[PDB]
Amino acid sequence: MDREALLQAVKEARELAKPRNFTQSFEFIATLKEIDMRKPENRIKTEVVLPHGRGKEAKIAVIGTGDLAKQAEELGLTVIRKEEIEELGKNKRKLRKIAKAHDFFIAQADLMPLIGRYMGVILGPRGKMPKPVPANANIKPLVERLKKTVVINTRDKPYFQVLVGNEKMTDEQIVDNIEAVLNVVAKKYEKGLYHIKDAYVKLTMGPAVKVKKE
RNA sequence: GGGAGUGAAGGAGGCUCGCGAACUCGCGAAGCCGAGAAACUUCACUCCC
């Protein structure tokens, strides 16, 4: 529908931006319409998987023991084993960094009551509260699912931002990445696809390219 | 599409200066903020003319 639009909208931002000493990632910003941001009414705190995903696999880490914690290493992930949970809670500088380094966290479920009490504080209101993992479960259907998961939270404000690619991936690829990010929209109450004002996209060190066609 | 502040998004970078007949090409132990939410690029909400 407005595919051609957003498509031109992004061809415009690839050169509308400077080369860099690393690679820029694409972000889409959205300006809402009529709501109140004050009602339980959807605030979008959901997460919906990205089709072609990013160019950068999300980063995961796990809190657990032995077997659960075993899936980790061979899976290439980083891991925080029990005792270190304390050792960390009394060393916040590191505690933090870790958090700014890993998109997601999964916990040996029965291990939350050590987490909340020890990693908790400097973790939760930073979006890093780790998700529980039942007893002895299989991780890949989720973890593997996550390397491409993208978050869509906004707290109480009529706007939002999400990643939807990386300078390395391709034009069209992003589109749908976005398109898809939008289906989130339609499902609520009655928010067709147009309950927002404008929409720009641009990457890390580039210009917020405008919303329309030509 | 002048500036303030606050918020949230991407982020490991960003930016100056010197020498060669040399714009962003080469050479430079030359310097300045940053990977601590706070550098850099932004968007929006309340301002200020």
CATH number at A74 reads 3.40.50.790
Structural contact between residues A201 and A209, judged by C-beta atoms closer than 8 angstroms: yes
d(CA A76, CA A111): 22
Domain with A155, as residue range(s), is 1-56+148-214
Give the determination technique: X-ray
The token pair that represents A76 in the structure block: 């290439």
| Angstrom distance, A190 CA to B35 C1' | 43
User: Which nucleotide is closest to the Cα of A30 by its C1'?
Assistant: B43
CA torsion through residues A80, A85, A88, A94, sign: positive
Residues A130 and A157 grouped into a single domain: no
Strand B positions closer than 7 A to protein CB: 7-15, 24, 35-38, 40-45
Q: In this complex, which protein residues place their C-beta within 7 A of any atom belonging to strand B?
A: A 17-18, 20-22, 24-25, 27, 29, 31, 56, 93, 96-97, 100, 127, 151, 153-155, 157-159, 161-163, 166, 197-198, 200, 202-208
CB neighbours of residue A49 within 10 Å:
13
Task: Give me the residue label for tokens 């939350």.
Answer: A112
A186 plus A109 within the same structural domain: no
The resolution of the experimental structure, rounded to one decimal in Å, is 3.4
Which nucleotide across the nucleic acid strands is nearest to A96, CA versus C1'? B36
Q: Given A91, A124, A147, which residue is the final one in a domain?
A: A147
- Radius of gyration in angstroms for the set of CA atoms belonging to chain A, rounded to a whole number: 19
Q: Give how many domains chain A has, as a whole number.
A: 2
Q: What distance in Å separates the CA atoms of residue A121 and residue A150, rounded to the nearest whole number?
A: 24
